[PDB]
Ligand binder design. Structure first.
Ligand code: AMG
Lengths: 133, 15
């Protein structure tokens, strides 16, 4: 898949992703906060189509992610991220995609997600998060 | 180096 790396910013304002209830997560794009103004991250699109778009609009900076969780699993021979859930201090968004495979979860007691990197081919292959205080 | 760094956790997914 094509690797991407957004880098670290001052917070997150909005997450736009797309999924398919049979396969996995497809498109991924973030609107970050950069010192009080939105910074539109580059769109990281799947190599194919047919996904259902989702827009996760956060009331920044009062609302911020306190936990990211999801499932990784095999899709057509590839281990990919089949599902993602974003929990804030205000609400829970997801799960999006298929909740089967091996679960993972990152509850944050102190700190903030300020950035994402990973890889998307047909589906999201993997992904990492930047953390800071 | 002249680039700041941050904690990074992951990746989850393909190896
Ligand atoms: C169908 O193959 C494409 O997608 C898979 C799963 O996303 C991997 O990214 C692979 O490298 C890419 O060629």
């Amino acid at each position: 898949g094509k690797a991407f790396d957004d880098g670290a910013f001052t917070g997150i304002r909005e997450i736009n992703l797309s999924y398919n209830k049979e396969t996995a997560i497809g498109d991924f794009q973030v609107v970050y906060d950069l010192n009080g103004s939105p910074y539109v991250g580059q769109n990281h699109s799947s190599f194919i189509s047919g996904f259902t778009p989702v827009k996760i609009s956060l009331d920044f900076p009062s609302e911020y992610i306190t936990e990211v969780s999801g499932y990784t699993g095999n899709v057509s021979g590839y281990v990919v991220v089949r599902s993602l859930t974003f929990k804030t201090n205000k609400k829970t968004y997801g799960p999006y995609g298929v909740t089967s495979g091996t679960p993972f979860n990152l509850p944050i007691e102190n700190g903030l997600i300020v950035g994402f990197k990973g890889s998307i081919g047909y589906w999201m292959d993997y992904f990492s998060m930047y953390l800071s205080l | 180096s002249g680039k700041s760094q941050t904690v990074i956790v992951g990746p989850w997914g393909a190896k």
